[PDB]
Design a protein around this nucleic acid. Structure first.
Lengths: 174, 155, 207, 261
RNA sequence: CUAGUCGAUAGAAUAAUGUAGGUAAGGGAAGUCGGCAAAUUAGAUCCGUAACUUCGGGAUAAGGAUUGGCUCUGAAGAUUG
RNA sequence: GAACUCUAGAUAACAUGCAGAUCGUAUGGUCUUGUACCGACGACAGAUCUUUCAAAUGUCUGCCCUAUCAACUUUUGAUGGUAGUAUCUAGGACUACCAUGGUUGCAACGGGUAACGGGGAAUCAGGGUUCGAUUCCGGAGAGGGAGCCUGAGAAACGGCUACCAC
RNA sequence: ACCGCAAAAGGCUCAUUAUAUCAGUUAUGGUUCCUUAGAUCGUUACUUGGAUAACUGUGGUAAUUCUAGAGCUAAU
């Protein structure tokens, strides 16, 4: 099956389709929150510590934590849970939600690998993305990057210079 | 009437036996704050020195008389603290400019200070809060109550 | 649910006024507290909007007043002996409004010895002959005005003998006055004068 | 509050003392919960557009009140549908307008100017005298204005004179049968003075017996009286001729006398 | 329990058919002369009761609900008041 | 017109929060430039009370047709007692305990209507008899019915949920 | 894109209902209340915490009407 595995140390995410049913047994019969290993799946993902962040089964029902039965439960929901975005305020709405446990009917697996093992994967770890920008809240970055009350923030803010050049010297904002 | 016969205890709420420590000695000759209606109607003397409890009494309960005020006649009095009175009026028709004898019947509540009201006595009536599903009035004064012929005389 | 209106209840001569505007939201009432005497729990709920009425469930204690002075002291409710109407609330021991409950007799003893230097009630001597620390805080002689103020005080310790029997046993009755189902408390006062001597015929004679 | 709260008011249900038209439009202004009541108020859209006639349409009002020209009783009151009830001072300094609200002989309202000193003070009735608000004493007026700590002889159902730019009381008058009065919202509304008698109903709603200067007797309930001075001694500048309520033939006398033909 | 009897030829043996006491998944009178052997119903309390009646019925109509064990309060008396 | 148990006054304790870390126009007095001390503000937030629009139950009088409906309502509330529960609050609203009642030939209860009331509409000398679904007002429903979130405010349906119909 | 309030107004309807709805006069001393305002806040980090939409990116589903995982970032 497809495995949308994420690595938060690099912040990247990539989908991996493995059709072998021998390797999915360590994904099979598992619940959300379970931390697994990927050495059985492939030599490339050896030493890697992985935990299931979620998934969408056949057909497209998101595996939601907080049900703990490996059937399909259609039920009403409220604010806030997974898969909910109401139109009026405080209302109730029902959709068929898949619950919390990995069985054979899982189409895709929204996974997160936690510890990088021995080798380098092109989907996740060869790709390297930084943060888009900083916090820019001077109270949270006071605790983040040592910006306390003796560390004035009017000349510590990062900027985002990007060439748009339409039609100017495209520098950043503040 | 009552020797406090109730499976609970009955007392007029809002008073307490405060015995020794007091601002002065406010005996007031009984620990019963009997109010008055003050709408020209004199208070009955038995209401001040009464032993009856009657939370729904207009003189001694959590009641203030409201609404309008009327008179009339009474028929039945079997039910407890409650009599059945009757009023009379007319109606004006279009076809004849003539009248009729129709009537309504409102059941009303009594304090026991108007003990022994009978058929067909004459009783004035005034309005108050709803008591239980029908009773929004209260008896004001045994004003006349005299049948000089058949009802109000001994034999 | 069930509304609290007149949707039921055929009108004053027997016939059935049938429907007329089936249902309204505001006209309803919720399931009641049914608070057994327990270990002090509480729950929050919306009311008619803005107001936060608080109900009680599985309650333990409260503060309770005094008769001739209005002295409100907080203490643990022990148990119940009697409810006013429903014996099927007596037997299950459920906290309601003005039912006959026994509470403590403890904190009223120590609180009153400023005015009521003679301790109420008379505790047993040969095991409690030591004072921890009673006899010093009774009088102390003070060399000053407050003991002298307590000389013209303690002229009001002429209290009823029945509670004096009850204070020395240590289990006083009281009457919880407030509403458990509007504020979530058990607030009351001791019945002292006439309903105290009344309800023991309703209890001890029926025992 | 139930499925409402009735946020509209159409044609023909507004009180017709507004001098409201009929054609074209199908709605009343419907003022918003201000310092006066529903049927007693007289808003800015009624006065300025249709009788002052300086704003042509309703969208013409949306500039002038948002450009902050009209201020009533010292406050600007930038909402166009402010209710603006009785005995309130329209403090429009351009071009020296200085209007108030006095009910007509015919019970309606009149375009009438006051002075700037008459704009400094105003007269106001009270409904109750209250004890319990800050700190111990209080006094409630008729127009949503509050008085804490007043002089202890002014009881309820009187009319006091205040400076609106301040929070004090400048003058008060008594509830006596030698006083100048104004009837507000009755059948006989809009006559000045000249009461001699009242009869206290024993529960309830005592009506008052008010005469005029020409011996014609009239009456209404107590909710309509506005005591406006002493014996032939007012405290305001008055409108046209003194609430006299003449006959239709006498009303037709002005139709023939003060006309050119 | 109290009194008294084992007195009905016997130890053995699990064939039919018969002799009597039974239950049998479906449908339920098709079966047969025929609803006949046989099955449901059964006590008591609470309602709820149809047409025809000589106005005493039909009346247990039909049509129904309810029913342990264990732990309790509420009621119906007598003598000395 | 008075226990208005009201916001007041006091005593006595009780729990649970609350008690603007908000903001820009436009900046200033203050220079010791110490960013110390200051301008109007708010479309700002909240508490206390008054006020306004309110709404939901009562109060009286006044409704269409039948004796081939003459007596009705308490099954499981009928009418009151009393305590209590809930409810934003009266209250048989509703539980329990108690009384044995409310109602009626002054057409009560029962059914029936091609009956939403009403402001109102049409015809002549009056008295009218008909109707008035329908712009105004008020009460109600969003297929059949029923629960309910959120909010001050629906039992809401151009919100949701069930079942049922199609 | 989080928020602020509103979305219960109007407009459509006469199908249920009979001393009920209503008409009117009439209580709320027998209650509540969004908001305008009107008085209305001298009772030890000080001007703090953490966390999310948009935004990227991996997507999914048989589906236009729904919706996951990851990287982020604020407050009246």
């Amino acid at each position: 099956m497809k495995l949308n595995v994420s690595y938060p140390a690099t912040g990247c995410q990539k989908l991996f389709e493995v059709v072998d049913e021998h390797k999915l047994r360590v994904f099979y019969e598992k619940r959300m929150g379970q931390v697994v290993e990927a050495d059985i799946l492939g030599d490339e993902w050896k030493g890697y510590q992985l935990r299931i962040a979620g998934g969408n089964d056949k057909q497209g029902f998101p595996m939601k934590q907080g049900v703990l039965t490996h059937g399909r439960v259609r039920l009403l929901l409220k604010k806030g849970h997974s898969c909910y975005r109401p139109r009026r305020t405080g209302e109730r709405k029902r959709k068929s939600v898949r619950g919390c446990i990995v069985d054979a009917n899982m189409s895709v697996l929204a996974l997160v690998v936690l510890k990088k093992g021995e080798k380098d994967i092109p989907g996740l770890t060869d790709t390297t993305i930084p943060r888009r920008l900083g916090p820019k809240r001077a109270s949270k970055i006071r605790k983040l990057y040592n910006l306390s009350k003796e560390d004035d923030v009017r000349r510590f803010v990062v900027r985002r210079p990007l060439p748009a050049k339409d039609n100017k010297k495209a520098t950043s904002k503040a | 009437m009552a020797d406090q016969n109730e499976r609970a205890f009955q007392k007029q709420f809002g008073v307490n036996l405060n015995r020794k420590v007091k601002p002065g000695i406010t005996k007031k000759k009984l620990l019963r704050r009997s109010r008055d209606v003050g709408l020209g109607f004199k208070t009955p003397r038995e209401a001040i020195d009464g032993t009856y409890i009657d939370k729904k009494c207009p003189w001694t309960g959590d009641v203030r008389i409201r609404g309008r005020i009327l008179t009339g006649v009474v028929r039945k009095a079997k039910m407890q603290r409650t009599i059945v009175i009757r009023r009379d009026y007319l109606h004006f028709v279009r076809k004849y400019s003539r009248f009729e004898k129709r009537h309504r019947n409102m059941s009303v509540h009594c304090s026991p200070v108007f003990r022994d009201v009978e058929h067909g006595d004459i009783v004035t009536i005034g309005e108050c809060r709803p008591l239980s599903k029908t009773v929004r009035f209260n008896v004001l004064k045994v004003s006349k109550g005299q049948g000089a012929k058949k009802s109000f005389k001994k034999y | 649910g069930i509304s609290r209106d007149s949707a039921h209840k055929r009108r004053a001569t027997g016939g059935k006024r049938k429907s007329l505007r089936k249902k309204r939201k505001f006209e309803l009432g919720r399931p009641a507290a049914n608070t057994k005497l327990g270990s002090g729990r509480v729950h929050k709920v919306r009311t008619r909007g803005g107001n936060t009425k608080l109900r009680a469930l599985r309650l333990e204690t409260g503060n309770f007043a005094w008769a001739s002075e209005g002295v409100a002291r907080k203490t643990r409710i022990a148990d119940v002996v009697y409810n006013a109407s429903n014996n099927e609330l007596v037997r299950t021991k459920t906290l309601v409004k003005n039912s006959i409950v026994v509470i403590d007799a403890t904190p009223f003893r120590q609180w009153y010895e400023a005015h009521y230097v003679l301790p109420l009630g008379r505790k047993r001597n040969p095991k409690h002959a030591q004072k921890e620390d009673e006899n010093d805080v009774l009088t102390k002689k003070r060399s000053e005005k407050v003991m002298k103020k307590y000389l013209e005080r303690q002229k009001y310790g002429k209290v009823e003998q029945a509670l004096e029997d009850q204070f020395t046993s240590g289990r006083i009755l009281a009457c919880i006055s407030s509403r458990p189902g509007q504020c979530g408390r058990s607030d009351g006062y001791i019945l002292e004068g006439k309903e105290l001597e009344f309800y023991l015929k309703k209890i001890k004679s029926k025992k | 509050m139930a499925r409402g709260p009735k946020k509209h008011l159409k044609r023909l249900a507004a009180p017709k003392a507004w001098m409201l038209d009929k054609l074209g439009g199908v709605f009343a202004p419907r003022p918003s919960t201000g310092p006066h009541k529903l049927r007693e108020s007289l808003p800015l859209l009624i006065f300025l557009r249709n009788r002052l006639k300086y704003a042509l349409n309703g969208a013409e009002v949306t500039k002038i009140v948002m450009q902050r020209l009209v201020k009533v009783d010292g406050k600007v009151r930038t909402d166009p549908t402010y209710p603006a009830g009785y005995m309130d001072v329209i403090t429009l300094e351009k071009t020296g307008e200085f209007f108030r609200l006095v009910y007509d002989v015919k019970g309606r309202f009149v375009i009438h100017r006051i002075s700037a000193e008459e704009a400094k003070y105003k007269l106001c009735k009270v409904k109750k005298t209250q004890l319990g608000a800050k700190g111990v004493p209080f006094l409630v007026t008729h127009d949503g204005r509050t008085i804490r700590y007043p002089d202890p002889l002014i009881h309820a159902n009187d009319s006091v004179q205040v400076d609106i730019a301040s929070g004090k009381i400048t003058d008060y008058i008594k509830f006596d049968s030698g006083n100048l009065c104004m009837i507000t919202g009755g059948r006989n509304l809009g006559r000045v003075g000249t009461v001699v008698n009242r009869e206290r109903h024993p529960g309830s709603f005592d009506i008052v017996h008010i005469k005029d200067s020409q011996g014609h007797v009239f009456a209404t309930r107590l909710t309509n009286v506005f005591i406006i001075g002493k014996g032939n001694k007012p405290y305001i500048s008055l409108p046209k001729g003194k609430g006299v309520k003449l006959s239709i033939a006498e009303e037709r006398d002005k139709r023939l006398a003060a006309k050119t033909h």
